[PDB]
Design a protein around this ligand. Structure first.
Ligand SMILES: [Zn+2]
Ligand SMILES: [Zn+2]
Lengths: 167, 167
């Protein structure tokens, strides 16, 4: 159903573009019987029409989150930028949201970024350790009445392993 | 592999039974050249040899839990036995262990038994409601950082629905 919908939507878009181009040409012909700069021509014409994503799109938001993770990983290699980022409160945001969401590669990249953010900062390391210990203790308190609590700590323990493995 | 193992184990058991019977017959023949009662004959002979389950068996423990649930459901229909059972502390045991384990029929039967145990007891109803509310609040506190917490409340809410639906 999605494939048929996409085909029909593309056909409709092509038809709309052709119709609007013809209307613009006819209007210009009627008017010829105003200078535009190079950027204004692109803005007005049909050239800048079909490269914008929908506002409520899951895939596009996922892609933007991937780009944000990549850019933040690049930025964190500067110690001053690392300090500013950890002062923004990025560690808790990455812990609550991006640890468990996305492809496996993205999850490992988020783990690497979280490890890098605490490379030589005792306060950031203490904060991350507090988050991990709190989650593990809260899960282990009710593990006995619900085993999924004990079996849904793999990412916290993986984060601990990754942080320790980097001397 | 399990099927082949079971076949070989059955063959070994049959061979052992034949050998032991022959040894008993030979010993009796040698001794004939002590009265036993009817129950003692069965105890001694090979008749009472192959009807005992292994101590560490998962399926047999599951079956015993099923029988316990059925017997307790039968017993709870007496108000005095119901009061004694709820005084034993059965509601918490059923809530913590048997709500999520077993086949779907067993789970629904456990829900029915838990509903029946609080049929006209304000204290038992308050205890069950406290358990449900506490679990739901604890899960909903960390629902934001972990959605499995929000999606693993189906049995508590089913229990609440079943308890309410019975006037
Ligand atoms: Zn999109
Ligand atoms: Zn068995």
């Amino acid at each position: 159903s999605f494939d048929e919908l996409s085909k029909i939507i593309q056909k409709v878009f092509a038809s709309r573009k052709e119709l609007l181009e013809y209307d613009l040409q006819q209007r210009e012909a009627a008017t010829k019987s105003p200078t535009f700069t190079a950027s204004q021509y692109r803005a007005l014409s049909v050239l800048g029409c079909g490269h914008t994503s929908s506002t409520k799109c899951y895939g596009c938001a996922s892609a933007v989150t991937e780009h944000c993770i990549t850019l933040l990983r690049a930025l964190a290699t500067n110690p001053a930028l690392r300090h500013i980022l950890v002062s923004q409160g990025l560690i808790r945001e990455l812990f609550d949201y991006n640890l468990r969401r996305g492809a496996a590669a993205m999850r490992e990249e988020v783990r690497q970024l979280m490890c890098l953010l605490t490379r030589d900062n005792p306060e950031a390391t203490q904060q991350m350790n507090d988050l991990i210990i709190g989650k593990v203790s809260t899960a282990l308190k009710g593990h006995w009445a619900n085993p999924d609590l004990a079996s849904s700590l793999q990412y916290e323990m993986l984060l601990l392993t990754d942080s320790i493995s980097k001397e």
